[PDB]
């Protein structure tokens, strides 16, 4: 049993690495100074629109407007990327591609943002967030100052990230934590729960052992970590409401078809 949980950890870690090119270690280094373009306002945003060439697409929309919009729209590019990376990594969780396709869709639909905010925290410190695969650093204060409702679309994630990073998880820990989140059996509209819960039981055992080996003096880390899953749901449901108020009060800005699918009929 012990050796198999270990092998399962090792495997997920391996796929976690292939699937997400920029890692916590990689990005923690950059942040501690262990040379990124800094975005602090509009001008330095555009001047950093050649940070990684540009967030293009950059279709022939988003190209455009005031700062909050330009940023809101660049956020969708990166988050389509992320959904693909995540989908990819899910396929690698043993047992997952064996599930009903409808169940597979549901798990990803409901778990994707929880994972996006989990992974984003690796990329943050109290003062700002990395972007463009660590080539840019966007300041927190800039992100708040965004006005209409776009302010505080990111402040809550910073607040969560700062607490989450205090747990000081590494990539090996995060690898299994993310697996566990995807294999959540309480997703609305699951067809049959039993096989998903069987897999999670397994990831949970593996996570528990990982925490004990890797963080031997961190008391009740396993518990503290599952408690973060509630923090995470709040951010997700807060985010969704923001989404709903944009799709009305703000002008008709376009949405990537992939995001529309995930967003429609979810809470």
């Amino acid at each position: 049993e012990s050796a198999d949980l270990r092998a399962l950890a090792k495997h997920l870690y391996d796929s976690y690495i292939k699937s997400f090119p920029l890692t916590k270690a990689k990005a923690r280094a950059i942040l501690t100074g262990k040379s990124p373009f800094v975005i602090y306002d509009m001008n330095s945003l555009m001047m950093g629109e050649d940070k990684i060439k540009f967030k293009h697409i950059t279709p022939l929309q988003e190209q455009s407007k005031e700062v909050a919009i330009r940023i809101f729209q660049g956020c969708q590019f990166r988050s389509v990327e992320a959904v693909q990376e995540i989908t990819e990594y899910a396929k690698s969780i043993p047992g997952f591609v064996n599930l009903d396709l409808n169940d597979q869709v549901t798990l990803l639909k409901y778990g994707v943002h929880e994972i996006i905010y989990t992974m984003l925290a690796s990329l943050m410190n109290k003062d700002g967030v990395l972007i463009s695969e660590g080539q840019g650093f966007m300041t927190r204060e800039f992100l708040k100052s965004l006005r209409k409702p776009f302010g505080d679309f990111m402040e809550p994630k910073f607040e969560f990230a700062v607490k989450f990073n205090a747990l000081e998880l590494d990539d090996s820990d995060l690898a299994i934590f993310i697996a566990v989140i995807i294999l959540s059996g309480d997703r609305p509209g699951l067809l049959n729960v039993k096989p998903i819960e069987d897999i999670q039981d397994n990831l949970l055992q593996a996570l528990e052992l990982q925490l004990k080996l890797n963080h031997p003096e961190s008391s009740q880390l396993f518990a503290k970590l599952l408690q973060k899953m509630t923090d995470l749901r709040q951010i997700v449901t807060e985010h969704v409401q923001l989404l709903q108020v944009i799709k009305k009060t703000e002008t008709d800005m376009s949405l990537h078809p992939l995001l529309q699918e995930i967003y429609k009929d979810l809470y």
């Binding site: 959904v83 693909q84 396709l101 869709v105 990803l108 078809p257 992939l258 699918e261 995930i262």
Partner: peptide
């Protein structure tokens, strides 16, 4: 599976 982009992502 009226999440068709996603169904494809998962469908190899």
């Amino acid at each position: 599976e009226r999440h068709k982009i996603l169904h494809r992502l998962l469908q190899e």
